[PDB]
């Protein structure tokens, strides 16, 4: 798990990383540690990414919002745990870290555990985009821009989602 929790690099949420696993954690280093169905195996999967502090609430069954709808979706019947910690010291830089991105536009909501890494221009209006960004023709990913002085809700949080199949 040190490979997962102490990975030096984390994924953008739109390109969330998934590791096949084939009470020590349950640690004062985490700020969120919520389990569903199977409170504290065939297969275990560790999905990890970075989102804003105030989006961690979206990494839970039955949630809505740009992260849950367009970036990472858990099923109603989720059995697994959601673990998060503040990573402002790692993922913010003076001037801003713009390397972390999220998907802002999509023609439909993700299905559970679906991953969308498309960079296709999003047609928001009546005119086809033909591959070019412009009015009502949007590049579908947007940078976070994590600055060290941001409030806590706007700071980067690293998230690990453990699924029990």
């Amino acid at each position: 798990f040190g490979e997962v929790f102490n990975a030096t690099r984390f994924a953008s949420v739109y390109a969330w990383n998934r590791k096949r696993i084939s009470s020590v954690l349950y640690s004062a280093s985490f700020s969120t540690f919520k389990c569903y169905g199977v409170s504290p195996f065939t297969n275990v999967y560790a999905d990890s990414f970075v989102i804003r502090g105030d989006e961690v609430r979206q990494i839970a069954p039955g949630q809505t919002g740009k992260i849950a709808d367009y970036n990472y979706k858990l099923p109603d019947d989720f059995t697994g745990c959601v673990i998060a910690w503040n990573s402002n010291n790692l993922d913010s830089k003076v001037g801003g870290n713009y390397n972390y991105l999220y998907r802002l536009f999509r023609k439909s909501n993700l299905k559970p555990f679906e991953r969308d890494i498309s960079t296709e221009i999003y047609q928001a209006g009546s005119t086809p985009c033909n591959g070019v960004e412009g009015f009502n023709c949007y590049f579908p990913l947007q940078s976070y821009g994590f600055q060290p002085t941001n409030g806590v809700g706007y700071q980067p949080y690293r998230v690990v989602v453990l699924s029990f199949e």
Partner: antibody
Amino acid sequence: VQLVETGGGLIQPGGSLRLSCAASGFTVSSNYMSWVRQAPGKGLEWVSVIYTGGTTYYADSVKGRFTISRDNSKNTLYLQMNSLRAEDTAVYYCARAHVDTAMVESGAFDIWGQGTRVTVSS
Amino acid sequence: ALTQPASVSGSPGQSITISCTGTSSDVGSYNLVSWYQQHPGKAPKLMIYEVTKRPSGVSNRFSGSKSGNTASLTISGLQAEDEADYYCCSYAGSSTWVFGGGTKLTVLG
């Protein structure tokens, strides 16, 4: 939520000048930003726009002479104006595109700076 | 450039309309007409977007419409504070915009 332009002044014909537009209360890195100018006593004229991925568009009256850009870290928009002519004399406004909560443009401009005057004259 | 009357005027309490005549590739092609109010020395203020819609806070005395290549702004119940310059604006295709030349609205005193 506001926009504050600086950099205007008197400049000789043929000269160059860079205008700045500092945003407060939103990020230019996540919004669709334009410059619009207004000659003294005259009407508004759209000049240029920049999209979040960097793609830019320009009025034909300024294409090849002006460049719109932004510095995300300073949360600032710029207009670099080269080879200025008398006809470029105007108040220059930076403006935010009006969007819905989903960040889709309505085609209108909701937040405007106070303007900065540029006078091209010898 | 969209074509607006240079001057329109009316008495307090009356209604007036400002027209904005463009072409088939701007007003004619989209439902993307906006209108702006501009008081002396101030920046333009958005009054109408998408031909007919009002931003929150804008009085319902202001309304917009379109027919063919001509958009119109109507102001009912004219009040002294409405005296200002008004500009129409249309999307023009290819991520460009066009403005009218502006109308001076006088509330006759």
